[PDB]
């Protein structure tokens, strides 16, 4: 089983990349419960650029062909208590995304679940032993509400809604 992401236009098969990192925004407020909610970053290119874990590919919500961590996932932030500051997530082992060329790119469900589980473990380290929830993007312009990237002179928009629908304990 794989996670299928709708992409427009159709990314050619040679644009398949390695997911090496993520950038997230922690939701503000509180729910009177031991839950912490994270979404794909609501910032702009400034948040992405300052992570410093990106490659030559220009991408949003996901670092493609970027730097990888050595041993385990590493999360960084300029201020963990400032929800206006994005959280840079650097994977240790990348997750491959395969674009068939018919308008959708695929991701291994089991491999993506394990990486999310590792990130939630590291997030619990910075915010206490709490429930970690991933939710889709809060909204924005198409290049930021979607996972976007450049490849061979073209720009592609992929809906990352299915990539953040999990709850972890």
């Amino acid at each position, epitope marked *: 089983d794989t996670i299928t992401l709708p992409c427009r236009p159709a990314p050619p098969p040679h644009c398949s990349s390695n997911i090496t990192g993520l950038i997230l925004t922690r939701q503000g407020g509180y729910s009177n419960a031991n839950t912490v909610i994270f979404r794909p970053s609501g910032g702009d290119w400034r948040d992405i650029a300052r992570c410093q874990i990106a490659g030559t590919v220009v991408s949003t919500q996901l670092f493609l062909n970027g730097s990888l961590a050595e041993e385990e996932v590493v999360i960084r932030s300029e201020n963990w208590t400032d929800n*206006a500051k994005s959280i840079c997530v650097q994977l240790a082992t990348s997750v491959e995304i395969a674009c068939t060329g018919a308008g959708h790119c695929a991701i291994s469900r089991a491999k993506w679940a394990n990486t999310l589980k590792q990130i939630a473990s590291k997030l619990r380290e910075q915010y206490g032993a709490k429930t970690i929830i991933f939710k889709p993007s809060s909204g924005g312009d198409p290049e930021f509400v979607n996972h976007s990237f450049n490849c061979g002179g073209e720009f592609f928009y992929c809906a990352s809604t299915q990539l953040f629908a999990s709850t972890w304990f």
Partner: antibody
Amino acid sequence: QVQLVQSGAEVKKPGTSVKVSCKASEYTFTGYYVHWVRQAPGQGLEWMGWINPNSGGTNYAQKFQGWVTMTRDTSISTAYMELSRLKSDDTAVYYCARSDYISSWYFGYWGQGTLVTVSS
Amino acid sequence: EIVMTQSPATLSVSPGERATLSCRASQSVSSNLAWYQQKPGQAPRLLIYGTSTRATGIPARFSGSGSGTEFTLTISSLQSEDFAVYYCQQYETFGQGTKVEIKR
């Protein structure tokens, strides 16, 4: 001088929706976050969320998630705040505030505030 | 959930005297705190940021201090325009506010 001008006061029946404007001037609209803060009559200040005007990304307080939508129009330097399915609890003065620098929480600039009365 | 607690709820000060407003955080937070003044019928006005730095144009009689869970706003000599509601702020969370009134 830098100022924020908001839309006029509105009276809304319960269960409807209201859209509040906030027009910015004399600064680079896309360079500073816009936050929305509401104040119930006689009560304190409550933060609802911010919007990144450069990208349109938003971060809502968990209380207002599913009830508030924040947008902007970069061409006219206007930020919009829409609340849906209004309740008597939502009767308050709604302010738009601008950060001192990019994404600070020091609100050096405020709008005059928009009063929204929810009543049948 | 970080809670900012201001005391007293209302502060009665004789005109021309010193006033001390307190603001206690439920848990220890960074020294990124701001003080706002709000006169009735008006939007809040920023007074202090960074827990000790005055905003531009704010008179010298306003001073901020504190660290950890305790933060204090001090007005050296109250004046007529200084009687209003004051809020402390740390990131997304505000205090419930302290009203400074004329004591006669």
